[PDB]
């Protein structure tokens, strides 16, 4: 990107380019279609993030809430998750 | 009504041919 830009500048400065396509246009169309698909995936990820946060949170307390909630839940699940195996193995 | 049923496979003989 920026490196290719600087190299292009150095090409238009340190020397004179006499040269003045299909794969480029094809890559452009492919990048466009991929951009559209990534946009659809971005909308899907928007709904997914909407289900993730579930609230506006005012974006001031959003970070702290996202930090606390996940930790609390992750600390909560392991207990029962390790608990069921006891009964299962007991009956078995 | 309908005719005789059509089987999905047929048995080899191997008996009288022996």
């Amino acid at each position: 990107l920026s490196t290719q830009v600087n190299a292009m500048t150095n090409v238009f400065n340190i020397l004179s380019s006499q040269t003045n396509d299909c794969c480029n246009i094809l890559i452009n169309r492919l990048k466009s279609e991929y951009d559209d698909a990534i946009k659809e995936r971005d909308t899907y990820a928007q709904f997914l993030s909407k289900l993730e946060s579930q609230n506006k949170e005012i974006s001031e307390s959003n970070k702290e809430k996202q930090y606390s909630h996940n930790l609390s839940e992750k600390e909560n699940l392991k207990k029962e998750e390790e608990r069921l195996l006891d009964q299962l193995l007991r009956l078995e | 009504n309908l005719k005789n049923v059509f089987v999905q496979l047929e048995p080899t003989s191997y008996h009288m041919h022996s």
Binding site: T19, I27, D42, L51, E52, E73 | -
Partner: protein, 174 residues
């Protein structure tokens, strides 16, 4: 501009110091702007006729170097320059050459200031789109912790209770 690189394949007899079978690997190198290219093929013996048919990409200003090497000993080394090739031109280059082995490899060569920079800018935009894809993946990953896993464990628990009903029924029959 752009110079298209498409190798038909390699048909020849290649031998090595040590005796052994190796998979044919066609190496493609460039002077500047491009990367290291390779082509996978399977022969394994001395004399072979194979077709690559693997499309490759290289920079505008560069010299395509096609060197066949087993996968290990070097079969053949062939140099090709796009300097002789003109704009919007498509042709084929058949290189019959010998170093260790006496070989032959057919590789076709085709072609495709502001336009180049525009193309590079487009590729850069594609790169930004890739970063956006990384952001989307990060979004889907950071979306939620383990949830449905507890639902699977819940299904296992349902199987445990069902097994309890089955064991109770068996106990009833017993």
């Amino acid at each position: 501009n752009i110079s298209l690189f498409r190798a038909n394949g390699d048909s020849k007899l290649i031998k090595e110091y040590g005796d052994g079978f190796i998979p044919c690997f066609f190496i493609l190198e460039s002077i500047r702007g491009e990367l290291l290219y390779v082509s996978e093929v399977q022969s394994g013996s001395l004399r072979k006729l194979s077709f690559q048919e693997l499309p490759k990409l290289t920079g505008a200003s560069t010299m395509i170097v096609l060197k066949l090497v087993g996968l290990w000993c070097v079969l053949c080394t062939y140099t090709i320059d796009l300097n002789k090739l003109q704009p919007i031109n498509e042709d084929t280059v058949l290189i019959t050459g010998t170093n260790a082995p006496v070989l032959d490899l057919i590789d076709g060569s085709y072609t495709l200031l502001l336009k180049l920079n525009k193309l590079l800018e487009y590729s850069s935009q594609v790169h930004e789109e890739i970063n956006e894809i990384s952001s989307k993946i990060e979004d889907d990953f950071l979306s939620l912790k383990n949830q449905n896993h507890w639902y699977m464990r819940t299904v296992q628990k349902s199987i445990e209770t069902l097994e309890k009903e089955v064991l109770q029924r068996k106990k009833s029959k017993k």
